[PDB]
């Protein structure tokens, strides 16, 4: 039912080698979600690494901008649930077999035969990105995804091969922390990790820190851009720009709006292509 020429293949599954050899089939395995006969391709990424043939088909990868074999996004290198939780639009897809699954899957394959270049619904909302998901976007990822799965007979001590067993050895797995939408167990801990980062400890008073020491101005930040980026938060009382240290001083009437600026600018407010420097003001008349 499905033929292909080349799969999606994000970089963490290609391997460390730009020179890999790959064999192909015409009708290979079924997808583990919808059982569609795609074309499984097989290659060797590394010398200590398993083959990682193919998990899903091309069509289900073209719905949500997903790679081919490890089920992560191509645009970041993240799972699907983090992506549509950060963008707050799920682009729903059924769960059963013959109820509504293959119906809308065949129709979305039928309407996407022209382009084959972009996903069906994420083309308009993958543009307003790089704000909340750029904070965890791992460059040069760990190659432990590519290492082979654990073998038996070393857990029981029966392995006659010894060192020439190609899979792994001396790796005790843990039965406490290991599909398409939900639910994923370590991903909940990853959302707890991004919800429990390392900010500055909030001093115990009643919102008196309305000043803020922001610097790194140079020639990109100007006064009108900064006061219009503060104007969407609210109104000023006394603002200034100092150029001997390349810094700006802003305050607010009732602190809370600038408080989310404190949520916005903990090495996080990225305007004009620069990681700005932010530390605390005095708020003490010192």
Please compute, for residue 180, the number of CA atoms within 13 A of its CA located in the half-sphere on the CB side: 18
- 5, 38 in Cβ contact below 8 A? no
In angstroms, rounded to a whole number, what is the distance separating the alpha carbons of residues 65 and 51? 23
* Per-residue binder mask for another protein (CB under 8 A), 37-56, x = binder: x----xx-------------
In angstroms, rounded to a whole number, what is the distance separating the alpha carbons of residues 107 and 104? 5
CA dihedral in degrees (69, 77, 145, 184; nearest 10)? Answer: -80
DSSP-derived secondary structure letter, 41: E
In angstroms, rounded to a whole number, what is the distance separating the alpha carbons of residues 156 and 194? 39
Q: Which does 154 bind (CB under 5 to 8 A by kind): Zn ion, another protein, none?
A: Zn ion
95 binds another protein (CB under 8 A): no
> Three-class SS of residue 61?
helix
Q: Which does 49 bind (CB under 5 to 8 A by kind): Zn ion, another protein, none?
A: none
Which neighbouring-strand residues pair with 215? 247, 277
Which of 3, 131, 189, 223 forms a contact with another protein (CB under 8 A)?
3
Q: Minimum distance between the CB of residue 114 and another protein, rounded to whole angstroms?
A: 6
Task: Return the biggest CA–CA distance within the chain.
Answer: 78
CA dihedral in degrees (205, 280, 223, 268; nearest 10)? Answer: -100
Q: Which does 30 bind (CB under 5 to 8 A by kind): Zn ion, another protein, none?
A: another protein
35 binds another protein (CB under 8 A): yes
- 63, 120 in Cβ contact below 8 A? yes
Which of 33, 50, 51, 77 forms a contact with another protein (CB under 8 A)?
77
Q: Which does 34 bind (CB under 5 to 8 A by kind): another protein, Zn ion, none?
A: Zn ion
Q: Which does 131 bind (CB under 5 to 8 A by kind): Zn ion, another protein, none?
A: none
Closest CA to 274 of 246, 251, 241, 250: 246
* Per-residue binder mask for another protein (CB under 8 A), 123-142, x = binder: ----------------xxx-
Q: Minimum distance between the CB of residue 5 and another protein, rounded to whole angstroms?
A: 8
| Site residues for Zn ion per CB under 5 A | 10, 13, 31, 34, 36, 57, 60, 67, 69-70, 151, 154, 159, 165
**Choice between 111 and 192, CB closer to another protein:** 111
Interface residues with another protein (CB under 8 A) are 1-3, 6, 10-12, 14-16, 18-27, 30, 35, 37, 42-43, 74-75, 77, 98, 102-103, 106-107, 109-111, 113-114, 139-141
């Amino acid at each position: 039912w499905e033929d292909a020429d080349f799969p999606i293949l994000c970089q963490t599954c290609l391997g460390e080698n730009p020179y890999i050899r790959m064999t192909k089939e015409k009708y290979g395995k079924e997808c583990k979600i919808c059982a569609r006969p795609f074309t499984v391709f097989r290659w060797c990424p590394g010398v200590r690494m398993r083959f990682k043939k193919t998990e899903v088909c091309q069509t289900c990868s073209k719905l949500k901008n997903v790679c081919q074999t490890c089920l992560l996004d191509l645009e970041y290198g993240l799972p699907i649930q983090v992506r549509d939780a950060g963008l707050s639009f799920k682009d729903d897809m059924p769960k059963s077999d013959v109820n509504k699954e293959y119906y809308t899957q065949n129709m979305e394959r039928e309407i996407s035969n022209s382009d084959g270049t972009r996903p069906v619904g994420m083309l308009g909302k993958a543009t307003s990105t790089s704000d909340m998901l750029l904070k965890l976007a791992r460059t040069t990822p760990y190659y432990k995804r590519n290492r082979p799965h654990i073998c038996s007979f070393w857990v029981k001590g029966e392995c006659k091969r010894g060192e020439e067993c190609p899979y792994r050895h001396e790796k005790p797995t843990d039965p406490d922390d290991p599909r398409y939408y939900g639910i994923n167990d370590p991903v909940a801990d990853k959302l707890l990790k991004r919800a429990s980062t390392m900010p500055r400890l909030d001093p115990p008073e009643d919102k008196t820190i309305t000043t803020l020491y922001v610097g790194g101005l140079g020639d990109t930040i100007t006064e009108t851009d900064l006061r219009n980026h503060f104007y969407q938060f609210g109104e000023i009382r006394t603002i200034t720009v100092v150029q001997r240290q390349q810094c700006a001083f802003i305050q607010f009437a009732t602190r809370q709006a600038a408080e989310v600026a404190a949520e916005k600018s903990f090495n996080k407010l990225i305007v004009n292509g620069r990681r700005l420097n932010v530390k605390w003001g005095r708020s003490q008349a010192a």
